[PDB]
């Protein structure tokens, strides 16, 4: 729905511990942007896009392009469900 | 090179007047994120990515995928120059 909401989905998917281990941003800052009604900055996106390169197009725009390796959590879940 | 710096490049490309007409963000807020040493939020990125869809992957990551339609201002300039 928004870049912010997609970013929050990825915070949950990674878990904040993994983000703290893979960037310079603190647990308290991650917790604040995840759960408090505050803006999320490009600094948080830096960590998320580096950790999830196959989610880059979706994170910034909500679009996917599977042929180019650009997918999303929901696309991957739908694929697994249809496979089952 | 950061998301913030690429975003500022696109602020200059569009011009703040045009950005104000294409989103809910104020002229003053655009001037602040462009010219003050403050963080830029995903709310500004919303306007930039919607206005520059061909620059989405580059905005979030610095990477291009020209075969997938994902380029950058500098890549287009290099293409213009090489074409000559």
Author numbering:
A (entry chain A), B (entry chain B): 2 to 85
Relevant lines from the article:
P. aeruginosa PAO1 carries two filamentous phage integrated into its genome, Pf4 and Pf6, found in tRNA genes at positions PA0729.1 and PA4673.1. We recombinantly over-expressed and purified Pf4r, Pf4r* (containing the mutations Ser4Pro and Arg80Leu) and a related repressor from the Pf6 phage (Pf6r), all with a C-terminal hexa-histidine tag for purification. Crystals of the related wild-type Pf6r (1.73 Å) (51% identity to Pf4r) had three complexes in the asymmetric unit cell; however, structural alignments of these complexes showed almost no differences between each other (pairwise structural alignments of the three complexes calculated by Super Pymol range between an RMSD of 0.235 and 0.266) and the DNA-binding helices have the same spacing as that of Pf4r* Type A and the P2-repressor C protein. Aligning the Pf4r* structure with the closely related wild-type Pf6r structure (bottom left), we can see that the proline mutation has not caused a large structural perturbation, i.e., the two structures (one wild type that dimerises and one being the mutant that does not dimerise in solution) (using SUPERPOSE v1.0) are remarkably similar (RMSD 0.518 for backbone atoms) while being only 49% identical at the sequence level. Therefore, to determine if Pf4r forms dimers and the effect of this mutation on protein dimerisation, we performed gel-filtration size exclusion chromatography (SEC) and multi-angle light scattering (MALS). This revealed that both Pf4r and Pf6r form dimers in biological buffers. As with Pf4, Pf6 also causes superinfection in P. aeruginosa but only from day 6 of biofilm growth. As for Pf4, we hypothesise that similar mechanisms of gene regulation are involved for Pf6.
